[PDB]
Each structure stands twice: as C-alpha cells, then as structure tokens.
Amino acid sequence: KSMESVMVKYDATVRNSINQVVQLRYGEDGLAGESVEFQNLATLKPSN
Amino acid sequence: KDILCRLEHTTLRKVTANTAIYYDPNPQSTVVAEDQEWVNVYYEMPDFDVARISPWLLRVELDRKHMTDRKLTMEQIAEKINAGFGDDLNCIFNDDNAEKLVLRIRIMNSDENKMDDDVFLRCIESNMLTDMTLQGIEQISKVYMHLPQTDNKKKIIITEDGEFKALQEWILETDGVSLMRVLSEKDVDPVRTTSNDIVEIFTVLGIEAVRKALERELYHVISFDGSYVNYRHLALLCDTMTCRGHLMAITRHGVNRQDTGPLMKCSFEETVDVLMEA
Amino acid sequence: DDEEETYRLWKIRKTIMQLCHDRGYLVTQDELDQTLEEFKAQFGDKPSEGRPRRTDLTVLVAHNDDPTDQMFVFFPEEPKVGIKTIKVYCQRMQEENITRALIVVQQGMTPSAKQSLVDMAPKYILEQFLQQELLINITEHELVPEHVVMTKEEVTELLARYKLRENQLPRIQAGDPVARYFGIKRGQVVKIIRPSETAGRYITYRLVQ
Amino acid sequence: DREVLRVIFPTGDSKVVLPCNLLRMIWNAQKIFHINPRLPSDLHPIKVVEGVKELSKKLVIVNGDDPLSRQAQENATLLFNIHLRSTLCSRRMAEEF
Amino acid sequence: RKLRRQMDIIVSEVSMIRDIREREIRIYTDAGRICRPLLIVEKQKLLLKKRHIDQLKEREYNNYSWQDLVASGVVEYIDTLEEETVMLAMTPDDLQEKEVAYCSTYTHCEIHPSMILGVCASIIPFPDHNQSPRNTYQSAMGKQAMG
Amino acid sequence: GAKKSAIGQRIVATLPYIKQEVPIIIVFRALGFVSDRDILEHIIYDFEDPEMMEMVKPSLDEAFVIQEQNVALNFIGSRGAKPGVTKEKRIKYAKEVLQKEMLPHVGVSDFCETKKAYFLGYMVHRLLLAALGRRELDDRDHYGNKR
Amino acid sequence: VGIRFCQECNNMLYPKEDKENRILLYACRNCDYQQEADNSCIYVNKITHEVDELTQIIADVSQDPTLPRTEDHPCQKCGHKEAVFFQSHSARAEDAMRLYYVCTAPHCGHRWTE
Amino acid sequence: TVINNWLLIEGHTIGIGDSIADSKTYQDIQNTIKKAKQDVIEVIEKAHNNELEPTPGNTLRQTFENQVNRILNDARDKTGSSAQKSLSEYNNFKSMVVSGAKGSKINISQVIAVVGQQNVEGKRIPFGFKHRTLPHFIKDDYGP
Ligand SMILES: [Zn+2]
Ligand SMILES: [Zn+2]
C-alpha cells in the first residue's frame, strides 16, 4: 500500500507517486538485484 | 558487574528482608532486645532529635547477600532516605559487623513537637519499598551480563600489523528502555550502545539513526534463520519509512499520514467518506 | 554527589565545544580536548558550593567565516529557567550584540518561557537544551551518520542538478536531535554522508521541515 | 582504498555483493585464451594500470561533468572500483592470473 | 469407593475426588463429565481374573456382559478430575509386576493404551511408528476416503 | 497512593444484576453477618495464620462504614440494575438479588443465607490462597474443569 | 502479628496510642472500647518470607498413592523406614526442588526435610 | 530428461532395510541413552539434595532444566551421529540426504536412533495434571 508507486525513474532516481525522491540511486548503487552476486574484497582482511 | 548495578533499577524492596512497625515509646528502652545494644551507641550524643521524637518506630532488616550483590552498604541507604525525605525522617542504622542489618526510622521531631502518627508509617513503608530508588535507572527492570561468542556482538579492532582482531568484551543487555540515561552513564560506550526500540532511537538520535537502526532490526529478523535478502530491498523499505522525516507506520495510522490523491485514500479504506470530503 | 557533579558539568562543556565546532564556530583544539583533570585542575576546589557557577561556565564563541558573528552558551543554576532569568540573558545579548544564543537546562524549562523564546525568535535566536541531552554527543554515535548543513549556493546547485523542487527532497523534522544539534531552521538542507555496503559511500539530502 | 574499506566494513567481513564476478571473468579469460600459468606473460603492467583507469570511466552510474555528478558517480561505484582495482592490479595480473 | 464399585447407592458415573493436600472431597454427579473405564488394581494386583475373562468369552448364551464387570467391581469409570488422584498402570504385565520399585501403589490399570485414539486414528496401522502430524493428517484423509 | 498502598489489596464481589461491584465484606453484612469475627470465621478457618488475616484487613476497612445488615442491603440495592424508588424498596430488591441471583446452586430458600455465607467465604478463602501462593491457579485448559 | 477482636461487638481492634500514658492500646472502632496492648508490634511483613513449608505440609499426604515412597529415609520420630517425599511446588519460592518427607506410619505424621 | 532416464536403470527406492541399523549400532545407541538417563538422575539428585548451585542469570529451576536439557540434547546428538555412521553407501535414506533432495540428518537419527525430547512452547512437557504430566507417573517426576 505504501510502496506501490515507488519506481526507478528515467533519471535513475527512485521516486514515489508524489514524485518525491526516495533514493538518489536505487540501492545506493543504481544496480538491479539480479546481476549482482557475492564476492570478496582481497585488500580488507590481510595484514599490512 | 559494578556498571550493571548502576543501571539495573534496585529499590528498597529488593534489598530489604523484613520490616516491622514497632511501637517503641521510649527510644532509650527499646522493645526489641538485640536492637537495644547498638541503639544506645547512637543515643549517647543524639543530634537533631533531642528535642522530640515520634513515639512510633519502623525497623527494617536488610538482606546481607542482596546488599553485597548490589554492592550496597548501610551508608548510602541512610543518606538516600534522608536526602529523599529531608528532615522528615530520622534514620539510625547498626554496624555491618552484626549478622543482621537494621535501620530504625522515626518521623521528624518538629511535626511531633497531622494525618496520623501510625498510618503514616505504613504509607511511608509502602512508599519506600517500591517508589524509593536506591541505585540504578528506572524503567530498566533487569540487566544481563555476558561475553559474546559471536563476531557481531564482539568488538573488532585493527591491530598494529593491520589485521582484524575480535576482542572478548563484556556487554550488558537490559529488559527496559532508557537510552538517554544509559548512554550518559559513566564507563558506558556512548557509540556502540543502542536499543531495539525504534521510537527510543528516533527521539534520542534522529531519523537517520532510525533509518540505520531500522536496517539493523529488519536485517536481524531476516537473517535470524540464515535467510538472505538483498540490501537494496532493505534500504528501500527503510527509506520509505523515514522519507518524510518522522516514523511512518505501515498501518493505516501511519499510511493515512501520507499525502495522496482522493482515489488512493479510497483504495486503503474508508472509501465512501473520503469521496464526500473531496 | 558533589564529587561526580564536576565530571557531569565537564561532559556538557565537552559536548558544547564539539557542538560549537560542528556549527562552524572557532574553538581551540586544546579546548575541545579538555580532560576532566584539566577542567578540575584549571579551577581546583570542591565543585558544589564552590568555584563553578553556571553563569561562570558560560562561554562565547565566534564564527570562523565572520569573526563578528558569535554565539552565547548560557547555563542557568536554577533547576528550572524562569522568565526573569531568560530576560536577563536577552539583555546580555544586547550588550554584546550577539544574535544567536544557546540555553542549557538542568531538569526542565518553564512552559511560559517556551512561548517567550518563539516571540523573540526573529530578533534573537534562542535554543533550549536539556542537561541530559548534552551529556552525550549523539553525533559520535555509530548509528548517526555525518550531517553537513548545505549553504544556499550548494542547495540551489543540488536542485538544479537533479531538477528537483524543495518538496521532493526527503524531510527532517526541525526537532530532530541532530537537527537541533546543528541549529538548522526550516528550509535548510542537510547533506547526510554514510557508508554503503552496496556502493561504499552514499550522500543523502534531507530538507528541514 | 584499503583504508576506506576498513571504515565501510569495521567488522572485517570481506564478503560483498557486486555486479561483475571478476575472479570468474579472469578464469573465463584464462580458458578462452588458453593462458599458460607456467610461461611468462606478455601483458605489460602499465597496460593493466592504464586499462583499469579507462575501464573505471566507462562504468558510469551517475552521468555528468559537474562536481555534484562526479562526486555521486565516485560514490556510486566506489566499492566496485576498489574491488576492480585490487582484483585487476598489476601485481596479481603478473603473479597469479 | 466401595458403594460405587458395588453400585449400591452411588452410580458408576459418579466421580469422587479427594484433594488430600487441600482437605477437600469433591463429589460430582452432574452431566457432561468425560470418563473412561479403567481396571481396578488392589495390592499391586488386577481385580480382573481369569474367571472374569472366561465368562466374557462366552458373552452370548451366558448373559454375562460388560455391566457385570462394573457390578463385580473389577472395572470402574474415572473422569478427568478423579484421574488426578489415580496412580495408573499402563499395563499389568510390566508396571505392577515385581521389579525396581518405581511405584508400588498403583490404583488402576489401562485396559489397553491404544484406546486413547479415536475412530479415525484407530484405523492407522502402526501409528506409533509415524510422526505425529502424519497421524493427524490421516485422520483427516480417512474421512474423505471412498468405500 | 499514599493510603492506597497502605491498606493493601482489597477484595470486591461482582454479583449478578448489579451494575458495579461491591466490597466483599458488604456482601457478608447483607447476608446477616455483622461482626468482623463472624465474617472472618467464614473466610479464615485457622486464626493462627497471620498471613491470611492481613490479606482481609483492607477489605474490612473498605466496608467499615457499613455496620448493619439493612445498611449493607441498601448499599447493594442502591447499585442494582433497577435502583429502588425508596430506601425500603432498595432493601427488598437487594434481598431478592442475594436470595436467588447470588450463588443459586447453594440455595434459593429464604433461610439459605448461612450456606451462602460459607461458600462465599470459601470463594474468598480460595482467592486468598491464590494471592498467598499456597494454592496453584486453576487451569482453564485442564479438561476436568470442562463439561 | 496477633489479631485481636473486641469483647463487646466482636469487631477488629486497631492499634492506638494514649498520650496520657504513652502505652500502645488496641482500641475498638465504633465501640468506645480499649484494651492493653502487649506485643508492642502492630505491623510486620517479611519480604523474603522464609516461611517453613513443614508447617504448611499436611500429614494426610502420606495416604496419596501418586506420591513416590522411599525406604532410604527412615522417620526420626518412630523409625518407620517408609517415607513419602515431594516438593513444595508453591509460588513465591522461585526455587522448588528440595524434597520434604512425611512418615507413612499411621498416626505418625512426622514431617522433615533433608 | 537425461537423468530421469538413467534412473530407470539405476533406480531409487526406500524401505524398511534403510531404517534398520547394526546390532552393534543399536547397542551403542542403547548405552548412550542408558547413560544419559543416569546423568539426568544424578542432576535430579543434586537438585533434590540442594547440591545444585544456580548459574548466573537463571533461577534454580532454570538451572536444572538447562542442565537436564543439555544432557538429553547431547544424548540425541551422540546417538544421532552414531546412527548416521552406521549407514552404508547403499542406504537410501543417506542418498537422499547427501544429495539434499529430501530429509536431513535429524530425520535419519529419529528414524533409526531416537525421536528425542518433545517440547511445548519451548519447554519440556508441562505438568498438566497435578504435579504430573500423565497419571502414569509419580508426582514431581522430572526424569526424561
Ligand atoms: Zn467493639
Ligand atoms: Zn514416623
């Protein structure tokens, strides 16, 4: 009911029916959920 | 554990064993035999009570184990009662050497020198048992202390070599919500400390803190059973619930707070009445 | 307790210095990093019924961009601030000609005084802060992200870039604990910068309303 | 970039969800071109450094040359670019891949 | 108890409950009380004997029926309230037989433990080898079968 | 409260055909037991138990003002669903309510007030044991409480 | 602790103080009657309430067939080997696992706890 | 389609033979359950003799229930692992569990070794009767 109209607009922002900006980029990265997948950051864990 | 005592709400009822309203007309000669020995010690040079003293007496016994468990001694309890009641009550307490901890209470001398001299003690006795606070923060019924065996509750730091080390620290979780008071408490991490109450977070930290807290609460329930949901779905819901700057309930209480056209309001509920207003 | 009371008053001063520094006022680095011993040693006596008076604890700071611009931080000794005490402070601002004033409160603020601040709000900006609130800097909480108050020049560019109206931005209540921390009024825009696990970093803009 | 990751992930969890799987893409490249790990490689390290720099510009999430767009573009692809730079670094391209 | 077992003044469906701790004896005669027949055990022995079984075997052409077991005081009905004061043996061959003295004061015995099941659960074969929800599902399916 | 927590916890009764509940001791006064000892004798059967005696102190104080059976009956009648036009009719209505509507299973005869006082005292006695923790609270799910 | 009833109307006697003599007096209400108090304690409540369960235990429980019986705890009063043991299982204790024993010998309702 | 037609040759079934275990495995399970019951009896004796010290954050009753539950929980795991190790490569219960098609380790152990503790609202079976779960037990019987 609340989230029905939230949509990715053609400026790549996420807005509702009122046209208010919910997110500047969908998911904060502008990517769809299907293509992404789990990966590892190699430079995070290891020591100096 | 010392920090836990300063947080958990402890009242006189928890640390007190039994209470008796003895008549005790003459303070010099006490009705209770054993009580007489140490009472005389406090009555060689009476102060502020020589002029008069209420005939009635209130004797309260304090459990030893509870007092030691809460790190409470005979002193601050007397000070707290005197501070709370000012000069209304005169408190005399025995020494910790005695197997029984005692605290004799009598009404002020000035009043002795209107409601009732006897019933008033019962009102005080009931009032002091529950309403009076010895040490802790109200609204926090119980506090648990444990070492986390999971990384999320563990403290992770970056060592000199640059590796991630998870330290084993003591973390306290409470059964009540007083975030502002607990956060200000000394020796309490004012950064990592948080609450599972979204309203408490909203009124203490803000809407953006709610947005982050709502993420963590929504993530915790979803990931409790090991399930995974993409973040972008978590973020979108938490963003719509905080887009307008105040807690937007998904019920009709918070949904109706949203501003939309007449037809949309009809879809939710109360269709007929809305159209008349439009 | 008298002994811990000096520690308590020190925390509010530390928060105020952090609060003032965040607002853009000039606060010395050593002043921000004032240890409890330094606060006690700088004065050196028993706090209660001693040297610290909430009038004495009042501090004056000046905006970095405009040295003439300054803000007053007033600590009242009375548990509840009265109309006369507020009236004393406003006259003090007139003597120094300081538009913005920050008022701390020990336990509560007189309901009559609440309307008084609104009445004088245009000529003088007065804000009341409970002592409990300032004991901790919420801005340093992990949940609270970094908040930056956008200048009108920045806000105009923001709307121009995204072709947005002010009503189309996310909103933040002027009573928000962070919003009160930065003393931002309606019509202001807050730039929130927070880490993102999908993008690394993410900038959010909230209109003050 | 390493310091930024530490702020983004204080807990030190390296698992992350990102668009392109670079390890499998490198593995696909090794098989498609019959790369021999034993023999010396003909890929100049600078071509790896230059190649990733050119690639980063093509992966546009927020388009625009103004500072507001550039900052948003840098933020939107920040995590991926850190992953891309560390995965396609010259050292790894010459040592293991 | 003696009168009920002899069916002299107290009918079979009358339940007498003594709460020893509370010093109360509750006698219930009203309707709506759910009860079941249980074999009476005295001195760690069944009052039901081979002679009772032999008479029941010739149920017809003998006029001996279930009512004679109740009249004989060998079996009696126990309601839920009385069952709280009853020390019940699941079987005679195992529970009240001489063994490690878990209990030596059995007052009643089950005729058969399988009578706890109802009509639809009583057609399930080996219901004690199935997961319990599957016995519940069959009780539903058994009422939708064809025949 | 100041005096609210001094007396303690008081017991009230919700009799049928009365809009609002009444203090328990008032019902005993209406039934014909005026003195406190006579009322407490129907509630506390062992006067040597100080714990039980304290539990009824707040109830006695609440109904201290009403000290006569007719006064108590008028109080019960005053709160009746159909208040009497005059005081005399109020007493008659209250008498009828207690005579038939209150604990009818105990009796409906004009001389059953003593039996109703004992059972009502037993209801209070049972309540005190639950409050004192001496007896466990009744289980609704327990199937011997069902019909 | 002692509860006193009036000797005239059999009503409750409540504590009262006479300033003339400064001695506790249990004075009847609505009865203009007074009595000489002797206990000197008008009110006492035990929050811990370490009330002995043996006093509450009823010797008749030895006749319960559902209670376990042990021959390893002979009765001290009479030496009867058999005894019936159980737990208090009463609220306000918060820890009810200790066993109370009651002698099974008729006419000897001795109760003890180990 | 490819493997549905190879399964026509290989075939897959499940029967009584897959639910059985070796006599040695049955003996091991019986020993574990017999010892686990004795362990719970000892915990009961400690509580009965007031020799059980409550752990922090828990009352005596919670301490006893925690100690009893872990003993019985450990027994189920010990017998469950033992039953799984007895399974052969040919066992069809294991084949469906190993492939992940259906069932789990707990299902195998319940079928072969022990169904385990039954809980209502997260706790052992309540004393619905007066201090008894059923009329077939003695009052205050906390055994498994
Ligand atoms: Zn009298
Ligand atoms: Zn004996």
Curated annotation (Swiss-Prot), chain G:
Subcellular location: Nucleus, Nucleolus
A single GO BP: transcription-coupled nucleotide-excision repair
A Pfam family per the record: Zn_ribbon_TFIIS
SUPFAM superfamilies in the cross-refs: Zinc beta-ribbon
GO molecular function: DNA-directed RNA polymerase activity; nucleic acid binding; zinc ion binding
Residues annotated for Zn(2+) 2 binding in this entry: C75, C78, C103, C108
Domain of life of the organism encoding this protein: Eukaryota
Amino-acid positions noted as binding Zn(2+) 1 in the UniProt annotation, renumbered to this chain: C6, C9, C28, C31
Zinc finger (TFIIS-type): 71-113
Gene3D superfamilies: 2.20.25.10
Keyword entries, A-Z: Acetylation, DNA-directed RNA polymerase, Metal-binding, Nucleus, Transcription, Zinc, Zinc-finger
ZnF locations on chain (C4-type): 6-31
Job description of the protein: DNA-dependent RNA polymerase catalyzes the transcription of DNA into RNA using the four ribonucleoside triphosphates as substrates. Component of RNA polymerase II which synthesizes mRNA precursors and many functional non-coding RNAs. Pol II is the central component of the basal RNA polymerase II transcription machinery. It is composed of mobile elements that move relative to each other. RPB9 is part of the upper jaw surrounding the central large cleft and thought to grab the incoming DNA template.
Name of this chain's protein: DNA-directed RNA polymerase II subunit RPB9
